[PDB]
């Protein structure tokens, strides 16, 4: 028996990245997984390095960040990488989620896999918002404010949970310093959460575009998918470099270059681009509590998918009505995020509400209704009993 196999530590590395049996037909959407792994590293490495210069103290916070930009060697490269790496993390995460949502990866025995993934989504969004607060720019302060207040919606203990988090009468020093503390901690949890995502992946292996079994034709992970992955890794770095070096601030908000101020919320306040669709869903409900319940629901609704997809076959590759309605969901999602960047004005409010309906109606009505029809359609189209 070979060493890479016999050693206690290399056998793990071996069965995961070298000998791992993969379905020969998996396309490039299967490359998003490793990309996320890379992202987690870029964020973590860049963060720890920047942390050596950061000061969580509210009076020093914003300036320590500028100190990184202006005085630390390659400090700007560190900051722009971390900030943009944060957005790419989401562009990729969304794609990774979409691929699965399309190819029915949330089904069959891979539910636990999907459920772990949903936790990682909730956690990543959290980590991201904790870090956004650390710059303590105008957007920071107000993001810090609004989001913590989301909990003041809880009926009885509400305000108490909120002031507990703040650690004061409002968002002040205690808030920003514990927020950095936590922004450092969660990433390591995400990392742990990832290894579980991997363990859950590893017992059934990846699926494939045909949505059928890949047991008949396997090819090792090494020297195929190790090199195929390399292609996307580079492609990924190439585009991230284009942003970091030639357009570092395009993905950001200008208000964050103005130090946070507790007496003035800027009329230009807008959430980070990756939070918009969710922001939009909340705005579309004129009730305080329902607004937050619906928003959180929009995330939790993804857990429902393995039960509402009644189809007898996996994936959208061979379903005309599903492929259609899938893209209707994708674009709807983009429209949702667009409404979010818009104002609360006449045509947009109603639009936001119609789309919110669609969003939820996708997982609850369309999919089950559509798939049942396709099951029957598939049957009668060839049965002559």
């Amino acid at each position: 028996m070979a060493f890479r196999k016999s050693n206690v530590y290399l056998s793990l590395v071996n069965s995961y990245i070298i000998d791992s049996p993969q379905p020969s037909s998996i396309n490039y959407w299967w490359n998003m997984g490793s990309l996320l792994g890379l992202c987690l590293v870029i964020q973590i490495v860049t963060g720890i390095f920047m942390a050596m210069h950061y000061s969580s103290n509210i009076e020093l916070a914003f300036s320590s960040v500028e100190h990184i930009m202006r005085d630390v060697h390659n400090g700007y490269i560190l900051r722009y990488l971390h900030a943009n790496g944060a957005s790419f993390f989401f562009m990729v995460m969304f794609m990774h989620m979409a691929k699965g949502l399309y190819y029915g990866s949330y089904r069959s025995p891979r539910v636990t896999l999907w459920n772990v993934g949903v936790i990682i989504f909730t956690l990543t969004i959290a980590t991201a918002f904790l870090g956004y607060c650390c710059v303590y720019g105008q957007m920071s302060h107000w993001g810090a404010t609004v989001i913590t207040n989301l909990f003041s919606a809880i009926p009885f203990v509400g305000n108490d949970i909120v002031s507990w988090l703040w650690g004061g009468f409002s968002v002040s020093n205690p808030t920003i310093q514990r927020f950095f503390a936590l922004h450092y901690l969660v990433p390591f949890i995400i990392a742990a959460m990832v290894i579980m995502h991997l363990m859950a992946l590893h017992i059934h292996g990846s699926s494939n575009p045909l949505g059928i079994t890949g047991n008949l034709d396997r090819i090792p992970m090494h020297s195929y998918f190790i090199f195929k992955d390399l292609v996307t890794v580079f492609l990924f770095m190439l585009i991230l470099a284009l942003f970091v070096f030639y357009s570092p601030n395009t993905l950001g908000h200008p208000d964050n270059y103005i130090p946070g101020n507790p007496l003035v919320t800027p009329a230009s306040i807008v959430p980070e681009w990756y939070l918009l669709p969710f922001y939009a869903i909340l705005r579309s409900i004129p009730d305080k509590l329902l607004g937050v319940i619906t928003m959180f629901a929009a995330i939790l609704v993804l857990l429902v998918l393995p039960f509402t997809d009644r189809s007898v076959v996996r994936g959208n590759t061979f379903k005309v009505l599903s492929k259609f309605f899938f893209f209707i969901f994708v674009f709807n999602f983009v429209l949702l995020g667009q409404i979010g960047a818009c104002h609360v004005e006449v045509p947009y409010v109603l639009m936001g509400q119609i789309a919110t309906f669609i969003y939820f109606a996708y997982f609850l009505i369309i999919v089950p209704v559509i798939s049942t029809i396709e099951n029957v359609l598939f049957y009668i189209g060839r049965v002559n009993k």
Binding site: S163, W164, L165, G167, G168, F169, S172, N173, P174, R178
Partner: protein
């Protein structure tokens, strides 16, 4: 030595007149241990949680 000839446990085997003695003692102990531990847990948890609530120096009533 025959296997049907069970060894002597008369040094440990309790002379029963109160069959449920070992049980009553064990379960009290176990239960008592459990009681104090929930209390200690509740106490540890509250200590940490409350270390986040507003610090003395920030309760400045203006």
């Amino acid at each position: 030595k025959s296997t049907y000839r069970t060894p002597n446990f008369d040094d440990v085997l309790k002379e029963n007149n109160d069959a449920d003695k070992g049980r009553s003692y064990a379960y009290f102990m176990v239960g008592a241990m459990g009681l104090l531990s929930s209390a200690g847990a509740k106490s540890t948890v509250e200590t940490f949680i409350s270390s986040m609530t507003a610090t003395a120096d920030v309760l400045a009533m203006a």
